[PDB]
Design an enzyme around this catalytic site. Structure first.
Site, short mmCIF file in Angstrom:
data_model
loop_
_atom_site.label_atom_id
_atom_site.label_comp_id
_atom_site.label_asym_id
_atom_site.label_seq_id
_atom_site.Cartn_x
_atom_site.Cartn_y
_atom_site.Cartn_z
N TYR A 26 0.78 -1.18 0.00
CA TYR A 26 0.00 0.00 0.00
C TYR A 26 0.84 1.27 0.00
O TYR A 26 1.92 1.34 0.57
CB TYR A 26 -1.03 0.04 1.15
CG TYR A 26 -0.46 0.45 2.50
CD1 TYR A 26 -0.56 1.75 2.92
CD2 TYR A 26 0.17 -0.44 3.36
CE1 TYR A 26 -0.06 2.18 4.13
CE2 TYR A 26 0.68 -0.04 4.56
CZ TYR A 26 0.56 1.26 4.96
OH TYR A 26 1.09 1.63 6.17
N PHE A 36 1.30 10.04 2.37
CA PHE A 36 1.59 10.22 3.79
C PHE A 36 2.09 8.94 4.42
O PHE A 36 2.65 8.98 5.52
CB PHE A 36 0.37 10.78 4.53
CG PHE A 36 -0.81 9.82 4.60
CD1 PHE A 36 -1.79 9.89 3.61
CD2 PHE A 36 -0.97 8.91 5.59
CE1 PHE A 36 -2.85 9.03 3.66
CE2 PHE A 36 -2.01 8.02 5.64
CZ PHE A 36 -2.99 8.08 4.66
N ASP A 37 1.99 7.80 3.76
CA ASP A 37 2.38 6.53 4.42
C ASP A 37 2.48 5.46 3.33
O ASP A 37 1.67 5.45 2.41
CB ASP A 37 1.37 6.15 5.47
CG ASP A 37 1.71 4.90 6.24
OD1 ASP A 37 2.92 4.64 6.36
OD2 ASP A 37 0.77 4.18 6.71
N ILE A 56 -8.22 1.92 9.24
CA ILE A 56 -9.41 2.71 8.93
C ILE A 56 -10.40 1.84 8.15
O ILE A 56 -10.05 0.93 7.41
CB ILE A 56 -9.03 4.01 8.18
CG1 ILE A 56 -8.24 3.75 6.91
CG2 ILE A 56 -8.33 5.00 9.10
CD1 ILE A 56 -8.19 4.95 5.94
N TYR A 82 -10.74 9.21 8.68
CA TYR A 82 -10.46 9.92 9.93
C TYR A 82 -11.50 10.97 10.24
O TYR A 82 -11.38 11.69 11.26
CB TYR A 82 -9.06 10.55 9.91
CG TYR A 82 -7.95 9.55 9.82
CD1 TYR A 82 -7.47 9.12 8.60
CD2 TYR A 82 -7.35 9.01 10.93
CE1 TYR A 82 -6.46 8.20 8.49
CE2 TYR A 82 -6.33 8.07 10.85
CZ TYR A 82 -5.88 7.66 9.61
OH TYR A 82 -4.85 6.75 9.48
N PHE A 99 -5.89 5.18 -1.43
CA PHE A 99 -4.92 4.14 -1.12
C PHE A 99 -4.73 3.25 -2.35
O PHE A 99 -5.72 2.73 -2.90
CB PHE A 99 -5.34 3.26 0.04
CG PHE A 99 -5.07 3.80 1.45
CD1 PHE A 99 -5.69 4.95 1.88
CD2 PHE A 99 -4.26 3.11 2.28
CE1 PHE A 99 -5.45 5.44 3.15
CE2 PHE A 99 -4.00 3.58 3.55
CZ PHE A 99 -4.62 4.73 3.98
#
Length: 107
Positions: A26, A36-37, A56, A82, A99
């Site tokens: 991912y 961000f990740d 999430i 979020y 994602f």
């Protein structure tokens, strides 16, 4: 809450069951495309248990709709991410996230 768009097809037959461990690669992005990740940056797959609510909601629910081998774009509503608060400093309020996820295997 989550919309799935295939990037590369899976086997079309082997879909996660509740309680299985999903092993994925991912990249999580803001709607603006900024990452961000990412597992991937880390060069190591990420594992989560479907049903444990440790990721999430949109990510889990999107992966539940994927087959092994599939790579897909998950467009995730703040409602399934979020929410109103976000994660200040990283995820803004009411953020839509994108994602890029590949379902590598189930364990």
């Amino acid at each position: 809450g989550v919309q799935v768009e295939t990037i590369s097809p899976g086997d079309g037959r082997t879909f996660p069951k509740r309680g299985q461990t999903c092993v994925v690669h991912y990249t999580g992005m803001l709607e603006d495309g900024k990452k961000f990740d990412s597992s991937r940056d880390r060069n190591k797959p990420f594992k989560f248990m479907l049903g444990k609510q440790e990721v999430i909601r949109g990510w889990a629910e999107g992966v539940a709709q994927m087959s092994v081998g599939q790579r897909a774009k998950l467009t995730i509503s703040p409602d399934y991410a979020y929410g109103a608060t976000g994660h200040p400093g990283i995820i803004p309020p009411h953020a839509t996230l994108v994602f890029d996820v590949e379902l590598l295997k189930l364990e």
